Write a protein that binds this DNA or RNA. Sequence first.
DNA 1: GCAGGAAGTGCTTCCT
DNA 2: CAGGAAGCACTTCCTG
Lengths: 136, 138
Amino acid sequence: GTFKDYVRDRADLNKDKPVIPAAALAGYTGSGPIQLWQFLLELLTDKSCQSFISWTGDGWEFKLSDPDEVARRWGKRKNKPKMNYEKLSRGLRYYYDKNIIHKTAGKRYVYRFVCDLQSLLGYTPEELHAMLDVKP
Amino acid sequence: GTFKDYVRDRADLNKDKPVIPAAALAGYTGSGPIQLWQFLLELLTDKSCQSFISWTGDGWEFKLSDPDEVARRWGKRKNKPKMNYEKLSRGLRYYYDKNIIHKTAGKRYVYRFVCDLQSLLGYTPEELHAMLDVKPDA
DNA sequence: GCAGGAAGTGCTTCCT
DNA sequence: CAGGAAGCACTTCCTG
């Protein structure tokens, strides 16, 4: 073990940041403004967020342990004080048809990315789970 | 001078900071995502941009001495590599009815905020001209 | 170039 | 928590 490695290891974050920052992806995609899912994706790639939202451990399956908090952030990111899970949800509903994210029937505040993320990001759920230290 | 002094002294600096940053305005008003007018307003209060965009010295009237650049920066802002004044001018054309901006008749690339920024921003056009050493056109 | 109609984009609002 | 249906602020096109 040398300083070379030390830097290498610290390279993979440890630092204080989200594996896939929304803005960045929006730039690599050129999708213009930031979209809901992109926002979430960053949430789910930042260990600091795992408290109110995280993955279930099953593929692109994730859960919103504390919606109100998520909706708080989403709204605050697009300067929308009157934001809430009620509205935020509606945004998600529009993702069903578009095949971007779907709902886990039977479970509340449980959804799953259905789009081809592995090929877009170049990361597999497990890689992410590992990096994020997902429990289940 | 104590510490707060030493702080304010060195903190007094911006040099590159625009008087009205679009995001902050969006924030204070909760207008949601940044909007083109709030954007242009940012650049007009950013001395650095006087090159391609600046005030005419009259009220809130201004000009785009170099559309193209403005277009590109704005395109960059919202991730729109295809942006150009041609499309951006469209945006601006929907403010005429919303009574936000209004194009000064008989001139090219010359519009004029017509909403009530004074009340909103707390500054008067003249105060801002001063802060930006603006030189009237003829 | 600049005034607008027209259609699409993506959430954000409203409401049944 | 769901939809259906409007809004809103542009982004893209096209016409004159």
